[model samples]
Target: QVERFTFQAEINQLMSLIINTFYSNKEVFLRELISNASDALDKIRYQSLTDASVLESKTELEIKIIPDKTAKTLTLIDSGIGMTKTDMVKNLGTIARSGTKNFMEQLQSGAADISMIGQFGVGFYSAYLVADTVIVHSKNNDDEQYVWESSAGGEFTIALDHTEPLGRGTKIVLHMKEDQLDYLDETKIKNLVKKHSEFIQYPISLLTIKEKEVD
Candidate 1:
């Protein structure tokens, strides 16, 4: 099932306004995203406390980051509580909760702290700071892997992705904008993650690039 969604008039305005209030610093993106993943990973662990069946076996809880300089891409892969088709539609589709509208009003009145992670559902949109196109490929044991992408022009598209890069988690790709190429450095990324996400509960792994010697 594939569909496009339009942000509510109020919601659209609020999302646009969010960036101007804060997020002038771009490195914070890695922090926000990893934190979200840590939160999702926590969800499944917490649920399995009562229902052992809620989580799968043989899957280690960790975060993997791959920085592809040749392709100008950075990927964040997590084994966490992934979303289903309906979950993607609702979570990425709209601000269905009442607080969104209230939060919208709060932004306009300078009462909302946009600096907070995962607040106003705008953390995801911060990807635009570094990339022209952001792609989120996710899969949960409960649903198929789906691709949700956006150029961050106030609208987005969602559809089923045949490729399942994750066993039960989410993979986000930041398609780098030409000018924001500093993120392609793996060493730089590790430093950023240490400062921002070192305290994250799960072991965050930064994959090393293997160089082929003309073999």
Candidate 2:
């Protein structure tokens, strides 16, 4: 069953602010996304320290950037602690219902660390800077796989995904806006990753073609 939802009033406002008013550096969208993925990986690592079974079979910790020019989409896949349906609603649906406003407020005080991006819950919204539509497929050990989607409109949708499972993690696909197709370029993405996320603890891989001669 596909379930639809309206963003909380504050979230709608926050989304507007992010998409139109804030973030002078539009490329920071990739940085924020990779940071969120790193946080998710850290969460699963911490969880496994207490409960051995939570890691399940997908133990490799890494992030992959796959850009499909044919589809005009960029996808970030992470083997991390994915979200349950409830988490999807709370985290993505009503983010500003929590502390993101405080995060925005504190930007002027100059206290926020790069890592704080994930904690403040506004990093994911940065996807709207480059994407017209965002689709997320996530799986948590506590629950089955679910797909969450939004176009940064007033409403979004969530549904039980009937496709191949992610094993354990999240896959975010961004339908790049026509003007933002530069993000789909291999060199551009590589440079952006090197520039912004060089110090991320886990390996981040970008899919690219290699020219080779084979007998």
Candidate 3:
């Protein structure tokens, strides 16, 4: 088993809080993202119990991290309930007072289901705690695939991406901050996953360098 586990806005959300986990040991970025991925999967699983329609749509469930040292990008992919354009508008953008409040509120009240853990919307922003530009890819039954991008500039852009590969879930690509390239190492990522996410309720997979043969 490997180790793994796991947002916000600008001036988008984190700016409102006086303090956050931003400088809390750079590796925390991975842990935060993994937890967010787990929440996505859990939300879908919770919805499946009553919404047979949504259940049948996203049958597979797991989390995968594709770390590209060459590209200097770390992508966190998950097969869980995805987000619609509206969801992105509200969750990923807009500097609101209670980010993800409704998400946690529902789970607390048992209105939706007993999952969707604590993604109070701050952890996501922690990416800027390291990375520069962020490209978020998500596919939802309610809406088609769309890419959301931001850089803590108090604003962001969202456009439909016709070529997205996710059937139903989310993929976040973090462009590693120049000096913080250590997060791109396979050993570091795998070991991080193995250490923190060993007990997560979903399957967490990370890339390793055992080597593969060519065809």
**Where does candidate 1 stray beyond 4 Å?**
14-23, 105-114, 210-215
Please report how far candidate 2 places residue 175 from its true position, in Å.
0.2
Stretches of candidate 2 off by over 4 Å are 96-99, 103-119, 209-215
Clashes of 2: 0
lDDT by residue for model 1 (11-91), tens? 456556643444567777788888878988997788778987767732678888888888889899888888787777677
List the RMSD of every prediction in angstroms: 2.8, 3.7, 9.1
| Selected candidate, larger TM-score, 1 vs 2 | 2
The C-alpha lDDT values of all candidates are: 0.75, 0.84, 0.70
* Superposition error at 40 for model 3 (Å): 1.1
Residue-wise lDDT of candidate 3 within 53-164, one digit each (tens)?
7866667799988888878888889988888988887766643655455554464344643222224555676677668788888998888888887665556777787765
Per-model tally of clashing residue pairs: 0, 0, 15
Order of quality (lDDT): 2, 1, 3
lDDT of candidate model 2 versus the reference? 0.84
Q: Pick the candidate with the highest lDDT.
A: 2
